[model samples]
Target: RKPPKGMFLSQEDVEAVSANATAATTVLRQLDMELVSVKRQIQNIKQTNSALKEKLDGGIEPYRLPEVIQKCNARWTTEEQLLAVQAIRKYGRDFQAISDVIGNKSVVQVKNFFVNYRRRFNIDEVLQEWEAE
Candidate 1:
């Protein structure tokens, strides 16, 4: 009552293919769920970081400075200097905190900005002068 063995797939063969397809679909669904979970975790981390930075910032007002066009890329702009100085002063040398407050700059870049800014204009001396004023 059946076709020859080689002429078409047997019922067992059809069932096996269907089972494999179902297993694959289940695995893909599980992977999709895991990806969503991972994305949620990443967003949670970003929110936590933002909250920590907000706490660190406390009563400090964000600096607003005019942007300057760069002739030479070697120099930090006045705005960059002010932002870095403000963040460092507020956060007490926490580069991560500083970078978060400054935004759009890496920790290494922030550190280097601090170092160069200090070297160029003796920040301690400047602070002392301001305090004495």
Candidate 2:
């Protein structure tokens, strides 16, 4: 029913259809069959493209590196460094609890860094900065 243009219909294609059909099923009939063939092919192709997008984002999720593993391999920040220093008066040399205040640091890491940079940060004054509660 929906022929693109009625003007100057396809001559060779119409002749081929007549050769195939003994009754000769007319020009509009040939064009309509062409439309049906292309329309169903588009229907088949459209389904494939619509489903392919579902494969792209299949529940991708981000995760965290937990504390113990992060302690094994990580860098220290300035805020964390000073926190460990300032934590000493409250905790004394209890590196295990000092590490909790430092966040992301282990007992050994907090203790070792304190020994390494004690004079550098003037940790003596930092210790005095604490007054007993």
Candidate 3:
């Protein structure tokens, strides 16, 4: 017995398969581009972290606070604030250093945290005296 016409794919079936394959290829290309973008973002983060570390080690003291304070809030966790204070004291009040130690915080945010912390503790006066000395 011979196979029916159903046994062979029609032109439309072949065209449909070809179109699907093309779509798959396009999607794969897009995925590859997305992966590359992700890789670049990761690399940029690493470089920024490295730059911050280097600045801290170089003793630049990019952002200096006169005194350490106890400022706690929703944005900054207690643990993060403690770590920041320790890092600032150990590394000489560099915001980048504190950010590096705390992990997952930008330098600007760390600076703001320090300001708020100092204000909460009312240590600004002490810091001014220390700076004067």
RMSD of each: 14.3, 17.9, 16.2
Give a tens-digit lDDT track for model 2, residues 11-124: 676666576555356656777999999999999989898788677555554444455434443577788777877788787767888877776887788867877888897767
Q: Which scores higher on TM-score, 2 or 3?
A: 2
lDDT of 1 by residue, 1-133 (tens): 9888778668875665478648757766888999999999999999999998888774545665656443333455688678877665566667898767666677788778756668775666555554553
Residue 87 of model 3 has an lDDT of: 70
In the predicted model 1, the residue pairs found to clash are none
Question: How well does candidate 2 score on lDDT at residue 76?
Answer: 73
Best by lDDT: 2
lDDT of 3: 0.69
Please give the ranking of all candidate structures by lDDT, highest first, separated by commas.
2, 1, 3
Question: How high a TM-score does candidate 1 get?
Answer: 0.35
- List candidate 1 segments past 4 Å from native: 1-75, 125-133
Worst 10 residues of 3 by lDDT: 65-74
How well does each candidate superpose onto the true structure, as a TM-score? 0.35, 0.40, 0.35
Evaluate candidate 3 by giving its C-alpha RMSD to the native, one decimal.
16.2
Evaluate all candidate structures by whole-model CA lDDT and list the values in order. 0.70, 0.72, 0.69
